[PDB]
Write a protein that binds this ligand. Structure first.
Ligand SMILES: O=c1ccn([C@@H]2O[C@H](COP(=O)(O)OP(=O)(O)O[C@H]3O[C@H](CO)[C@H](O)[C@H](O)[C@H]3O)[C@@H](O)[C@H]2O)c(=O)[nH]1
Ligand SMILES: O=c1ccn([C@@H]2O[C@H](COP(=O)(O)OP(=O)(O)O[C@H]3O[C@H](CO)[C@H](O)[C@H](O)[C@H]3O)[C@@H](O)[C@H]2O)c(=O)[nH]1
Ligand SMILES: [Ca+2]
Ligand SMILES: [Ca+2]
Ligand SMILES: [Cl-]
Ligand SMILES: [Cl-]
Ligand SMILES: [Cl-]
Ligand SMILES: [Cl-]
Ligand SMILES: [Cl-]
Ligand SMILES: [Cl-]
Ligand code: NA
Lengths: 520, 518
């Protein structure tokens, strides 16, 4: 008698989470873990927290109380005091006592996973955003003993090394950049993975892995990720990292003497990166992130040019600003194509005679016409309202880490040196690279702007806005990203600089650039 | 870059023990020796309503083995020692049925809560000889599968039919499965006692030992409730008989006794030693020492060729387990006698005998076999042994052999019966009609034509009658010489050579001893 058997239940996974000073990330992080597409009855939670200066243990307690019932079992290990290690130089410093405790904690979770007869233990760092809900399944599918998903960061940094130095140090190899950029996809044998990775406790070799104490043959630095990575060579467990698709993101780790506000803003920049091509990462339905309140960053006005039909750029940029606690006046761009040639003459507009595209030798486009007129209207509004220092934004740009603090301090430095300035490039395309641009003395992170090529974001002074309107550019219309290099007299073509008599613009660029385009 | 092997699946062995002290050294010994990794095994043990030291045996075993297993759960309950609504230790009152169903549901919840792959139920008196039974059952990849355990009778731990009312039902499938005629894993409506549940299967979630299913309307019986639970879960119960897995005592009536159980499980140990080495106990439990006696006979003999050590040790083991003590009579090797030593004894064959099957004359083995029985006959007369019991060395003891044989001799001597010979093991030849009953003495018949010498009781008056005929001059095979002496041999030529055939011979009925190999 043939009789069909019912399906096998999903593998049993223990999600082990260590949390110290992570209240900034838990709404986005724990919310992602809830929504993992793995049956919660085949999932268990293991949570350890201590040495907190923020309200990390409170947020965890409330999340766990909220989801305790959906899971197979929950383990809760808080420790309110002490709030910091007796041998630390700061919270972002990795002392040996901190290295030891975290090693003991991951061993504790590992033993905890073994004792409950789980199939897998998945480690997730508290600021590791596992955006893809299928990540756990895809990692279980590769059938590796220790496999990790390649999480994306703002820099080359990711949760894996391609080389190692026979003394445990990091090592570049030709394979890193290809894997990191998803040019080669697959699951690659690597000497080091960390942050988030999946251990398959079904494999016999997993019985020989340990996070603490180090292997008897260990002879390297007291460093948690090195100790575990060495446990894998001795167990002959090969570590793998996969990038076959996107899984999640993570912030670049700070230095020892970094602050918590550094870390908080770093994870906020992670949320920005996600929004470059994804919807904003949603929080848990039981945890709320604290209300933020924006400001103008000390400028007199913050503009953002946006064409009304570009709705999604608008919503993205306003989300990107809200999270940075930045507020702006939205300025509706002039649709150049919507201008019949009658309305073009009604404003006295004529192209700069004999203008050709620097790459296709073509005339001024209706699109560039509207772009110029949008900035021109902002210059007109600057003079009307007498705005001393205004910040101008276009609507398709990605922000650097610590954008607000880094910009507010250059303005404070420029002011304390009383620098006579008209225009400060916050984002541009530096066309003069063969020798460094002339550093501006006494003002850190500021150079004299040579030939540039964009208008993504700049700071304009009321003096500068007068100098630009003064040139009467409407009659000699030129792409605004070239009208400016003409005005600070660094444009290459001399024929163009002839049509403008008084080219007296003090133009400086922020160095390095704080704003880049989304698409490149 | 190769991946390491997967660990063995995770099994929880659930063990409900009540009044099992007679079995646990043997049963637990079998379990602790299963070929399946101990780290991939967990123990769940619950005991209560004990009248024997079951609690102490399990505790003694658990304390020893605890440190080798993934986990040990342990649920003892010393008081009360018996159910308030019971009629005896072998009575299954509703309170017992309810408590047992709850303990199995308790184990099923335990196996689930600990993320086990399988829960294995083994009753405390189920002997799992085959160490591969657990691995073999896991391999069949079923959701509820039981190994077919062997019993002394047609009983086993499965049914082939179940009525619309939940009652047992015979089908033509049962006997071939039971005898290992068909060897597979067969879908059946009932398995119990020892079976394996696959907790990896989504359907195993719907299984429950207690409470009964909402649609349940049958008797408040534990095995029925679980069987109906699989039905509602659309889980097919299977039983496999591909090889031998283990043995199992036949259950007893409600008004049965603890000693009936202890001796009935000893018969499993006996049935095991028929074709296997004896079933060893756990190396962490000591079995209770046994004090052998003589059963009231003046002597108990056991004929054994000195060369046949295998037979000797087996019989000695079988006798010790039954608390019976014997006098080993080294047999007479009829083949080792050169013709001159045959003549020294003055032995002539009965002129004309030929085997009723292949027609050969009397053999050398049949000679020494007669001389061994003959030499014991002399020793009964020598020592004045009123009643003695004679054993050969290749015979299979029935259940309750000791008490049943003692009780017969007791009814015999109470009725003052003029007896000479009592077959305990034989081959009955007259089978057309029943042999004659001996009034006022149950389980005893006047022996007609018989044809074996496995086991028999003999009296001093009988030992004299045999030696009186002086058979060494007219020697038949010893098993034909007796039906001559009590005047039933079909060959009147053979009965002619014996002038006086006055022997009073009887037979236990049914027989208490049978041959091992046929
Ligand atoms: O005393 C502590 C220190 C850290 N953590 C937790 O352990 C994880 C460490 O995260 P961090 O952001 O603080 O660490 P980094 O971003 O600096 O990157 C880390 O990546 C590895 C983590 O897998 C190693 O911890 C490595 O030493 C370290 O550089 C976090 O989940 C943190 O919350 C604790 O529970 N208790
Ligand atoms: O109060 C109790 C009653 C019983 N048991 C245990 O239950 C198992 C089965 O009981 P028995 O072996 O004494 O009874 P049976 O030999 O007759 O076989 C059983 O066959 C099925 C096996 O489950 C059913 O349990 C059925 O009720 C019962 O007859 C035994 O291991 C016994 O130790 C307990 O632990 N506590
Ligand atoms: Ca981190
Ligand atoms: Ca039984
Ligand atoms: Cl420093
Ligand atoms: Cl310092
Ligand atoms: Cl320093
Ligand atoms: Cl114990
Ligand atoms: Cl049979
Ligand atoms: Cl039955
Ligand atoms: Na420092």
């Amino acid at each position: 008698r043939w009789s069909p058997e019912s399906p096998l239940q999903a593998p049993r996974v223990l999600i082990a989470l260590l949390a110290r000073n992570a209240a900034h990330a838990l709404p986005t992080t724990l919310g992602a873990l809830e929504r993992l597409r793995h049956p919660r009855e085949r999932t268990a939670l293991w949570v350890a927290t201590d040495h907190n200066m923020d309200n990390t243990s409170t947020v965890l307690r409330e999340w766990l109380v909220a989801v305790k019932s959906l899971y197979h079992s929950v383990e809760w290990r808080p420790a309110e005091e002490p709030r910091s290690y007796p041998d630390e130089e700061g919270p972002k410093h990795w002392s040996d006592s901190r290295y030891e405790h975290v090693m003991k904690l991951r061993q504790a979770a590992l033993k905890s996973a073994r004792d409950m007869w789980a199939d897998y233990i998945l480690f997730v760092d508290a600021d590791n955003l596992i955006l893809n809900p299928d990540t756990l399944s895809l990692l279980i599918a590769e059938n590796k003993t220790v496999v990790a998903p390649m999480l994306d960061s703002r820099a080359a940094y990711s949760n894996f090394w391609c080389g190692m130095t026979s003394q445990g140090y990091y090592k570049r190899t030709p394979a890193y950049i290809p894997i990191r950029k998803r040019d080669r996809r697959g699951c690659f044998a690597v000497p080091m993975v960390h942050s988030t990775f999946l251990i398959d406790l079904r494999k016999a070799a997993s019985r020989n892995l340990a996070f603490y104490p180090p292997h008897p043959d260990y002879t390297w630095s007291f460093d948690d990720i090195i100790v575990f990575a060495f446990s894998c060579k001795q167990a002959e467990v090969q570590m793998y990292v996969c990038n076959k698709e996107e899984y999640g993101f993570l912030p670049v780790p700070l230095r020892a003497h970094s602050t918590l506000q550094d870390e908080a803003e770093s994870f906020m920049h992670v949320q920005l990166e996600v929004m470059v091509k994804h919807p904003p990462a949603e929080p848990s339905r039981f945890i709320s992130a604290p209300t933020k309140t924006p400001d103008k960053m000390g400028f007199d006005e913050v503009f953002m040019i946006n064409l009304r039909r570009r709705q999604d750029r608008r919503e993205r940029m306003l989300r990107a600003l809200q999270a940075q606690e930045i507020e702006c006046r939205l300025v509706e761009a002039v649709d150049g194509k919507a201008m019949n040639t009658s309305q073009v003459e009604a404003l006295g507009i004529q192209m700069l005679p004999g203008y050709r595209d620097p790459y296709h030798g073509r005339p001024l486009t209706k699109g560039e016409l509207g772009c110029f007129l949008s900035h021109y209207n902002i210059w007109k509004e600057v003079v009307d309202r007498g705005l001393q220092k205004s910040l101008v934004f276009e609507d398709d740009l990605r922000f650097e880490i610590f954008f607000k603090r880094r910009l507010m301090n250059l303005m404070r430095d420029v002011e304390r040196e009383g620098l006579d300035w008209d225009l400060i490039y916050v984002g541009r395309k530096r066309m003069q690279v063969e020798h460094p641009e002339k550093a501006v003395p006494r003002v850190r992170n500021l150079v004299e702007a040579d030939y540039s090529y964009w208008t993504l974001a700049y700071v304009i002074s009321l003096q500068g806005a007068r100098k630009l309107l003064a040139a009467e550019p409407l009659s000699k219309m030129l792409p605004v990203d070239e009208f400016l290099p003409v005005m600070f007299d660094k444009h290459p073509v001399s024929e163009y600089k002839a049509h403008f008599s008084l080219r007296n613009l003090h133009a400086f660029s922020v160095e390095p650039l704080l704003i880049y385009p989304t698409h490149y």
